[PDB]
Assembly symmetry: D3
Homo-oligomer: 266 residues x 6
């Protein structure tokens, strides 16, 4: 695993964005061989999407041959509602880059047959073969996407009943109304995430401290899903300063020294 | 992983039995595509076999196209001895259901060539392809079948020298005589168990408390084999109240709330 | 996992050597089907190479059809320098056995194109298919070869910048001069090691106590690479008395009783 | 230590109040030998003060010869401000019982010489000799009164700079304004608390779960001050259900069985 | 603390007995200044009483001026019943030594007023001033005498309701009848024990392994009363080999080396 | 407890020295009421003695009425040998300050009757009443002075057989000869140290990291003597940066923020 210890969210975004850009340019995607990118929504990926857009406008990347798959979507919320994941993604990323519509994959929270919808999402991915880089965040309890703790490390895209905590936390977007927030959501599984060739988790804020610690210093265990990324062939944790509160001083010094060359510039 | 927290052994049996029945009816086994079931012996599976028989008599399941493979057998004990696993299985299950004899697989504790016997057991399984649901119990130290702690998570069917503790614990069936109890036994390996598509462990009694805790809350480690089920794609722990003594109050509250819909009726 | 608890390094060497010899004679290698052996250098493997040579001279083994792959080599150090791994290997093993030169694989610390060199090493291995037995040691922090803690359990042969600690520790061979010791080295990855059919780690000295404990009693975690051998299908830890200082009295008693038959003679 | 596990805050209050009443009636205080009571303010002691008042009105206790000492007070906040501890105490307790004004001891957050004020508070206590029963609550981090974690277990009454967390948490009383909340407060020390003959901590809410666990199951350590009550001669933890989330199922079952006789009625 | 690691119970007894004898001869007790000895009953102290008697017959000690206080007694069991602690003490010790009857203190399980009985026991001790050496054993859960886990480290002589586990364990003396075994017992408190100038705990059997570990390696905590002896000015743990199963190999090696001079002979 | 986290040893010395100076000037010692100071020798106290001397020369302190007691001395080493603690103390401190010879207390490693020597040292201290500030260091294993781990927290001045590790570590002063280093030493006990009104431990170097962690974050336990300072009424840990390697990032941030005002200047 790699731990990129940075100070700010702006830095994390720049670093994460640059890593994606580099992976893409090195892959050199074509129409027959696109670079498949897994993506998250929310406040965490904010600075990364912002950096990605900048680099693109600076002419450093083209998403012309990048295929994206998003982690989740609200069930029963209309696509153009400003708080659907589809809306967040276009407003924050797609509206400013050259990615073709056929290359954008998002779950249909309004599909009549949910199981079929999820099943097909999994199928669309396999049709491409594999996701080259799946970017995501982590819950305060180490959970991934809408997967609950103790999820099978082999779980797949499926619908989930949002937890009270998730509700309140998102009630703010449904303007502080936890009553507004949808009841269910469609989410990729942990297996879906782990099948990615490379996984990059964005860790921001002191409230992620315990999860960062479980991921980096703790032992592999299913209650803290994030900890199983220790078994993944290519995982990276990109974090800010506040999130490092639960790590030993030496652990942080280790990675800060080991990755010093890679964090200059961002 | 799933944790079905129930109060009694009778409930655990009803729940476990119903799960097996459901898996079977949904699979809809045929002569060319049978449902393969892994099975344990002993006091733990008692209420489950009892429930399975009831459901069958109630006309809810047919084992006409179910192929079973049992975890173990005593070496050098004659099949019709009432304390062989073969005898336990027929008396408690096979004598009351419609499973054909060719569909019943049990290790031959009397095979002249033991290694060959074990080797062939492994081969018979692969011939079918895979076990769809392997039911079992767990040792007080988290061990599986006759496998000892620190067994390779890839171990296979082989003969084992029973431990003093196992002897005494079973001496009761050889009527409190630990002297009667056989010295060796043939047991499926941990790899054999993990290759099952789904694994369901029955946990009964306060003496399993530490193992349940190692399985659910602890970290993955080989000393407590049961803990590695955390890495399995589809594992379920069905337990009674006494076995939950070592879990945190919140851990138990979590699963009790998460599985409330699934435990009504049994 | 297996833990062979012995008293001395001489015993560990005899045991390890005998195990290799046995694995070879049982495999019965030919020109078209050689036995592939992974090997380490350093003070730890000393008594084993010494025992291996004895057994060979005693006519108990022939390495005529054994192909070996070594874990590492210093970058930019000339092959005949007495402190290169190539020199250690010939002086301590190859000079006294019947292994053909084409069967000896060592990394070229002087290859003009390092990445290509490493890439090809990985390719040479796959050409043979798989390593049947990879012998190695472990760092005081549980690390393997020149891989650093938190290495991906899927890492591959690559060049590494030696750590200050490694320098000092080896400065003695570059006659107590840490200034002499080379800056980089080529090392097989953890994935390379884990792909071995069987892995045997030599643990000598009280300074390995914590690592032995992490391997045997601890939970699976990437900071202590050695602990992930718990997930390997066939791992053995052969150790001396001083290295057992951090194990519980009962843990050591367990393995000492479980392996009593296998440690008589050595 | 004693752990009274109850379900609700109302029960905790009834139990705590009854214990105080009983201690008083058994002591049978006089003008020359009063019963000295240590007291806390805040939402936690709410139901207890309510129960104490009821019992008094029911004619079950008289505070005519009870001397009270309160844990803290805001510095620089006028006594009659409705949010001073003096105001909370009279409105919630003193206004409804027969305690004489000379028997009420509260720190003077407005004393011109703070050190002298604190010094004298400590002196007033010793003049009486000892506090017979000190009731209090506990911070989410196990801290006591306004004492910070790692306070000397021998600390004494002194002024403290309130922590941001304390501010926000109390900003609600200064009507959600954290800006209103005073900057410093006068608080009894941990030594002051431990010198009490008997200490009774009220634990309500899931946010106290970790502290309850540190107090009951954890080891003695100064970071979680509450844990040192394990060394106190007569400590009791009276708690509600939510606060028990971090305890083992068996720990809670132990105390629930051990104190079953004492919790009927309340 | 001191840990005397011996191999057998016979050795533990010889060592413990010799220590008592030495403490006595060095004190040189008189009629006005007797040596006060705290004593336990049960299978654990067996070899010690046997050794003490031998040394006395060998003319190495006289108990003419030794005053003894025993830890407990069954409530409502007649003194001459062969299973009362009074009977165990005379049959195993007093019947063979020169201690005067007025120097023997045992709790009166038949006192009409129990609280008074206990109160007076505490008073008799203080009249002498202090117990010079209190010998005892430890429960499998680290508890002392009939004190339950989480007892105040300042508890005193009082009556206790025996636990089911204690019953069964002692049912053997009431000839395997747990129905025979008395319901309550009078026991000295933990405070009583800790006030002893020196405390010596006899630890025999693998079932005490966890408690020995909690006492020697664990942290101070009230759930394992024995662990608080770490805070006592003069505590010694005399143990046999089986009881050391939970200690680290190095911990045992430490004390075995530190006390090598003191364990030759016994 | 207090933790003064500084960057360098020079800072630690300045801080420690300033604290001593302040304690003295505030006490305002006289001929009839001197300030009693406990002192350590070795490399750790180096910068502190250097700072103390500076402040004295700067006219900020007079040791005219300061009585000092040193922690230890080598047995059988002549006082004027340059490596005796007496020599270290004069050369590094006494030779440059105004302390009278009658105010200097050092153990006599050459006393004919050692027990008497130690006994009297303890008596000299009590004659003064109490040590106002005892400064010291800590072993890599948390031990204090020459006291071994698991020492009674009530131990007293006595002779000790130096450990191999202590030998080697000090062999450097007996010019790298571990053969030169004396075999025994006289050391104050842990009780002696804890009786000090205030205890200040100097922690320098990464090798003290584990001990600093045991002192600050760990639980109270006798194996790490330093951890029991958590129970002391007035303890301070003054440390440098390297020694903080084992602390959590947040723990260090806590004290760095809590003591920011007190570490400016030094």
């Amino acid at each position: 695993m790699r731990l990129i210890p940075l100070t700010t969210a702006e830095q994390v975004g720049k670093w994460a964005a640059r890593h994606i850009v580099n992976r893409i340019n090195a892959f050199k995607p074509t129409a027959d061989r696109p670079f498949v990118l897994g993506l998250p929504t929310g406040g965490t990926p904010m600075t990364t999407y912002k950096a990605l857009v900048e680099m693109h406008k600076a002419g450093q990347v083209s998403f012309k041959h990048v295929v994206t798959f998003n982690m989740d979507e609200y069930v029963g919320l209309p696509k153009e509602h400003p708080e659907s994941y589809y809306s967040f993604m276009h407003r924050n990323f797609f509206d400013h880059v050259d990615i073709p519509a056929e290359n954008i994959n998002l779950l249909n929270g309004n599909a009549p047959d949910i199981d079929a919808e999820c099943r097909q999402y999994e199928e669309k991915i396999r049709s491409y073969g594999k996701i080259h880089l799946f970017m995501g965040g982590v819950g305060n309890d180490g959970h991934i996407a809408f997967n609950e703790p103790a999820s099978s490390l082999a779980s797949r895209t499926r619908i989930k009943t949002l937890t009270h905590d998730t509700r309140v936390a998102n009630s703010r977007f449904f303007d502080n109304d936890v009553n507004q927030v949808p009841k269910y959501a469609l989410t990729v599984g942990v297996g879906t995430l782990l099948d990615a060739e490379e996984v990059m988790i964005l860790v921001l804020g002191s409230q992620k401290a315990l999860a960062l610690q479980a991921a980096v210093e703790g032992c592999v265990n299913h209650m803290w899903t994030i900890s199983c990324l220790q078994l993944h062939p290519k995982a990276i944790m990109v974090c800010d300063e506040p999130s490092t509160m639960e790590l030993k001083v030496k652990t942080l010094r280790y990675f800060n020294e080991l990755e010093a060359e890679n964090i200059k510039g961002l």
